[model samples]
Target: ESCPSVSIPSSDEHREKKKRFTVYKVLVSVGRSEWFVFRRYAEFDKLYNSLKKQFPAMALKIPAKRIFGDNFDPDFIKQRRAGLNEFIQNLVRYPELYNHPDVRAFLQMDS
Candidate 1:
């Protein structure tokens, strides 16, 4: 129960998608605690909005959402995932959000 920080293990993409969407897992870590957050662009988009409301002063450069063009494009998913992961990584940099109960559960849900 001790590792003065958190980290997201780097993951690559290959055979993790369906007809029109991609599925990826983010391996988030906090000391000896870890959790796999499975999601697509939609989840990342929503998470960005939620975090923005929670932290107004926070700066996050999330990838723009697609409307009608290749939502599941391989390059698109890669960049979006990078941006989303960056957002979460930045959020934990602040002790306020990092210590939040909701954020903890959001990263490591038992359900």
Candidate 2:
């Protein structure tokens, strides 16, 4: 008796020429699992410290603390939203960068 074998795609020249992509589906039976896990167990301060230690220059440019600040003032939020909208509108003026996949994903997540 012979068992069936699954054929994995090889990265040959022909395969590379074909525009193929793989999709990995994750099922979250309990809703908001990622958010719950992060909120419950992740020490964000420690993670940020580690990242800063690893990449000092890159980390310096990151506005992690500022971005996650607890300034819940309605006026502040409104101003921030306006600034973000203006920035995105400026990007929209450049069709190429505005329509890039990464920009699209960022905009979708912002929504």
Candidate 3:
């Protein structure tokens, strides 16, 4: 089996009420099929924890939290996006990890 090509090419910033955050654009390509989904950092972190609970033996690492800094900064978003891209890429390498229901839901593959 082959893994899909995943990339985080861009992100969007949105404000709701008093809060503001960024949603990273995740592009997935499996063979000739490709599509994108906008996901928030919280979602990524949730999936990471879910995976850890479900597969405790697997090595998992995600970008560290930096609560004191401005998360909306361009440089911060860029680095975080790269880290997210790498995080998903690492998971997709293993069928067991990527094929899990949690991952499928995270990628919006559930129908």
Candidate 4:
């Protein structure tokens, strides 16, 4: 199978218990098939951390964590969403990487 086209089209903030985080809306389109995966920054970080170990040669792209500023700012969220979108868009360019379970699971292609 070939690589799919992925995009983060949008994002939303969520409150879980005492913690608040932004949720990303990930869209993966492979020819006629499409998928929607909702994930938080934490999950994306975990995915990146795992992939970083297996593929050190490839320069992976993921947005950095902000320490001082407001993470919920509208502008920040938009930029983060764009970065996340780019991250996936870049990864899917390589069939070798996108076909991996790490990427598939992140796109919700695996159950």
Candidate 5:
């Protein structure tokens, strides 16, 4: 069984998210070859919220929205991407959030 990995480049967050990350180009690949598509963080947030709802047993933490807060920091955005990617790596390890429609939408965006 093969799966695509999200190519979250070293990029911006606010400039990417909201609509959400649709503006920023995203790559979906299994090995080297990839397809281009767009996405948003609020979508990811929806996935996270769904995960939280469905898997009430497992304790999960996700990146929170900071209203009127400082997301302008480069280091913080990098950390956010790294952290969220790491979270995905783990979340997919199980079937709850991994098999959900949100995750499916993310993967289906390929092309």
Candidate 6:
């Protein structure tokens, strides 16, 4: 799945419409390597806290546990599916939090 590209609203109406949007679902996953690194509770907690603050309502819906499961057996097909699922979920949820400054900061720190 392709990650969604952000589109900024060019008019006041669009911006106002955005403000009323709410994200209620999401999926989050990490690759084998990244997952291992993130298992350090401190790192994961810090990142999670930041994201939670950034998207107070929507971020709560993200499936951080199942998506980031500890099953890294190096199967190309499985990895791809997991990645696609994660990407699609995030894309679908992205628009609801568009132009949110806290989200932007969290993303920057995440990168």
- Write one digit per residue (lDDT tens) for candidate 6, span 1-111: 223332211111112445531111222233321211111222324545666776576534322333344333335324433443343346337654433444433333134
Q: Which residue runs of candidate 2 sit more than 4 Å off their true CA positions? A: 1-70, 109-111
The candidate that wins on TM-score is: 4
Q: After superposition, how far is residue 73 of candidate 4 from its true place, in Å?
A: 0.6
Query: Model 1: per-residue lDDT, tens digit, 1-111?
Result: 222243444434435345344656677666566677766666667766887887777677777775578766667766666777777777677667766666666666333
Each candidate structure's count of clashing pairs: 0, 0, 0, 0, 3, 0
Residue-level lDDT tens digits of model 4 in 1-111: 656888888897788897888899998887788988899988888988898888777788899965478888889889888888888788888888788888888887765
Error of 6 at 57 (Å): 3.0
After superposing candidate 3, which stretches have Cα over 4 Å from the reference?
A: none
What are the lDDT scores of the predictions, listed in order? 0.63, 0.32, 0.84, 0.84, 0.59, 0.35
Residue 94, model 6, lDDT: 60
lDDT of 3 by residue, 18-103 (tens): 78889999998776778898899999999998888877887778997766777787898898999999899999988888788888
* TM-score ranking of the models: 4, 3, 1, 5, 2, 6
Clashing pairs in 6: none
Candidate 2 residue 61 C-alpha distance from true site, Å: 14
**Model 2 clash tally, residue pairs:** 0
Candidate 2 Cα lDDT to native = 0.32
Candidate with better TM-score, 1 vs 5:
1
The estimated TM-scores of all candidates read: 0.70, 0.35, 0.89, 0.90, 0.65, 0.27
Q: After superposition, how far is residue 63 of candidate 1 from its true place, in Å?
A: 1.2
In the order shown, what is each candidate's alpha-carbon RMSD?
3.9, 20.8, 1.6, 1.4, 4.1, 17.0
Stretch of 10 with least lDDT, candidate 3 = 102-111
Quality of model 4 by C-alpha lDDT: 0.84
Candidate 5 C-alpha lDDT tens digits along 1-111: 455566556454344344423223455666667775554556667767777777678766666666355565556666666656665666666664556666767756333
